[PDB]
């Protein structure tokens, strides 16, 4: 579901709600068209009508994602949904909660105001009010006249509202939808949604009935105001105290009242402004340029750039886009973030393999630099590694790049908290024909295990540079039979995670024995394979 992830968006939303409430209050309180109506109804008319105006906008804001899904189904296509990082996910729920609570507050105000209004309306019908109210209410009993008091039946003040709320539309639906709202809010409480889902998701589907009842709810135009045509003829400010001679004199013809227009839509302004503000926020956040901070060299062609950009969330295991207008004005190249979160730079490792990369050497001399533009951090996250106890890392060929992101990030969390780091040891196993042009990673391995030795610890270590074919080098295939057993016997109930990165030729060779090794019960030895998924 959509969200804004911005304090500016929240502020503009609150401002829009306040503005809508004030504007509709003034619109229904000031004009002389709603003179007799508000005279009979006190101040409850505006206090009851403005919250409905705000509630329509808030309810549409709630419902919008379902309309988006329906439109996507109609088109026959569907835009690729964004990934989850547990931060872009657990901030939309906050917005959902705030919108739901504001809907509840406005519904409470509207219900209280109309509950107050109905009492006066049914009290004025009977001979139990001031003379002006009872004189006004006794309209429409004859022909060629339209009523103003909707309680067109004299029973009593108590039990009169009970009959009114049942025999009259928009009163039964009001009760039905307020019960639905109460049930929806109560069902989604904590200790009911977290612990259970058969009673949260199933009951939360009362929103269809709630929305149907709301759509039916506004109809029959029960609240009536003086018609524009008859307003000029009536000349209200003169024929106001002559309540007892209406119709029987020429200057004061009997006024006629009609309901509100049945299709006006002035509240869309809200959803429209919120959308435009979100889009402008996205524009600002993406216009800022990127400034190169540190550029370094490496053996052969492994030039690495470190740049700082405002308002960037590196995350982990993602990929960004790089574009140099000097080399070409219409090309975006993808690269993998070889860095860690809570840092400042990017550290994207590029190696000359073609011509555009060489465009950063001849055009951008190394012995006053091109303006690099970075698009954003797309791609699915990789956080299951940080949520495990023991890990089984196995790289391969050119594809060890993303592992450098994890290693530079696991140690940082240790120096900060040293309690949430549930990792035990990185069983890193690097397989390659040669390390000819990957010296930037082998350097990192000795700069991590040795560096972290200062705090009197050698828990992970396990640098295992291995040679497949033609510095503990196996000089051959690292056979996996009995390899995992020796380390799986240390901790019962093994949750070892293996993250392969290589061709499918050796991929299925790892899961063939994993199922065989497993046995029933929450005690046996088993390592889970994620296959092509990381």
């Amino acid at each position, epitope marked *: 579901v959509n969200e804004g992830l911005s304090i500016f968006v929240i502020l503009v939303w609150l401002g829009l709600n306040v503005f809508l409430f004030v504007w509709y209050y003034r619109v229904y309180d000031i004009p002389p068209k709603f003179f007799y109506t508000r005279k009979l109804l006190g101040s409850a008319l505006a206090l009851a009508r403005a919250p409905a105006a705000c509630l329509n906008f808030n309810c549409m804001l709630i419902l919008l994602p379902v309309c988006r899904n329906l439109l996507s189904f109609l088109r026959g296509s569907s835009a690729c949904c964004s990934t989850r990082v547990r931060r872009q996910l657990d901030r939309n729920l906050t917005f959902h909660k705030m919108v739901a609570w504001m809907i509840a507050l406005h519904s409470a105000i509207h219900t209280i105001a109309h509950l107050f209004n109905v009492e006066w309306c049914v009290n004025a019908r009977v001979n139990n009010s001031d003379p002006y109210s009872v004189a006004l209410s006794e309209l429409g009993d004859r022909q060629n006249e339209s009523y103003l008091n909707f309680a067109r039946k004299r029973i009593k003040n108590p039990e009169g509202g009970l009959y009114l709320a049942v025999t009259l539309l928009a009163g039964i639906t009001g009760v039905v939808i307020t019960l639905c709202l109460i049930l929806i809010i109560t069902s989604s409480t904590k200790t009911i949604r977290r612990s259970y889902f058969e009673v949260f998701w199933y009951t939360h589907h009362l929103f269809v009935i709630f929305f149907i009842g709301l759509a039916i709810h506004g109809a029959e135009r029960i609240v009536r105001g003086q018609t524009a045509e008859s307003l000029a003829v009536h000349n209200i400010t*003169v024929c106001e*105290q*002559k*309540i*007892s*001679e*209406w*119709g*029987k*004199i020429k200057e004061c013809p009997i006024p006629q009242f009609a309901g509100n227009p049945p299709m006006t839509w002035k509240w869309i302004v809200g959803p429209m402004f919120l959308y435009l503000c979100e889009r402008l926020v996205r524009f600002w956040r993406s216009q800022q340029k990127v400034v190169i901070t540190k550029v370094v060299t490496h053996p052969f062609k492994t030039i690495e750039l470190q740049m700082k950009k405002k308002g960037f969330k590196m995350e982990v295991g993602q990929y960004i886009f790089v574009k140099c207008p000097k080399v070409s004005k219409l090309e975006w190249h993808p690269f993998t973030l070889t860095s860690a979160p809570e840092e400042d730079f990017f550290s994207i490792h590029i190696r000359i393999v073609g011509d555009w990369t060489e465009g950063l050497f001849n055009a951008c001399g190394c012995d006053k630099l091109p303006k690099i533009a970075v698009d954003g951090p797309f791609g699915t996250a990789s956080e299951d590694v940080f949520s495990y106890e023991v890990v089984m890392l196995v790289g391969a060929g050119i594809g060890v790049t993303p592992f450098a992101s994890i290693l530079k990030s696991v140690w940082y969390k240790y120096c900060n908290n040293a309690t949430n780091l549930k990792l035990k040891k990185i069983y890193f196993y690097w397989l390659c024909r040669d390390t000819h042009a990957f010296e930037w990673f082998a350097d990192l391995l000795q700069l991590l295990e040795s560096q972290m030795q200062e705090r009197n610890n050698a828990g992970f270590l396990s640098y295992n540079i291995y040679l497949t074919g033609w510095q503990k080098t196996l000089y051959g295939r690292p056979n996996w039979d009995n390899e995992f057993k020796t380390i799986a016997s240390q901790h019962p109930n093994t949750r070892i995670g293996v993250f392969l990165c290589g061709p499918e030729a050796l991929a299925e060779t790892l899961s063939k024995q994993s199922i065989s090794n497993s046995e029933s019960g929450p005690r046996g030895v088993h390592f889970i394979f994620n296959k092509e998924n990381f």
Partner: antibody
Amino acid sequence: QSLEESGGDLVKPGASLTLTCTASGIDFSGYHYMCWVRQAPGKGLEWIGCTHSGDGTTYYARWAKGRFTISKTSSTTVTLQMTSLTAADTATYFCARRYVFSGGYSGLDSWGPGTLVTVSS
Amino acid sequence: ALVMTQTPSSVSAAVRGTVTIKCQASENIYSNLAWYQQKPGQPPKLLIYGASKLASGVPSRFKGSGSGTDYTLTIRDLEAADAATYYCQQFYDSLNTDNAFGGGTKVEIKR
């Protein structure tokens, strides 16, 4: 429940006069009109101007527009002011209350006696 | 703008007879009439209002009926001390009018 007015006598042509109508037992309040009429000596009754106790709405006959002014003072006195008197206005003047009966229909009850306004040189 | 006239100017009826007076307007006034009786002395006294109802203390002999633009008053049981002048007034239009009080009738006792 009884009205009474006075303040008219022989005046020279072209002058101005004011007649005041007072009542005992009646409070000039509510929504009952106050309605001034006059009658020529031995002729039919004529309608001059006839105001409203509530608010300040006033109405006048076509022949007596602007020349006559009606005001309500102290909630118990009503004054009619006439300007540029001629020889035609030498008639008796009545002060009457336009009671608005239940339902809407109205009548002219609780009249007051006359006041022989005469204009001559 | 609005003209209201009485059809008979002076009717004559013997004691124990009948009297009929017709007041007709120039527009459809929604039965907002009122009939007054004026003796040679005293101010005129109201008889009926609304063209059909009765005042307080008036004998039920006086009768009025009509609709639209034509209205009528019928006198039952004419007797002594009933020779006076009768007027019809319209409480409908009071912003463009000249008299709004009818013309009057001069019923007198015949003996």
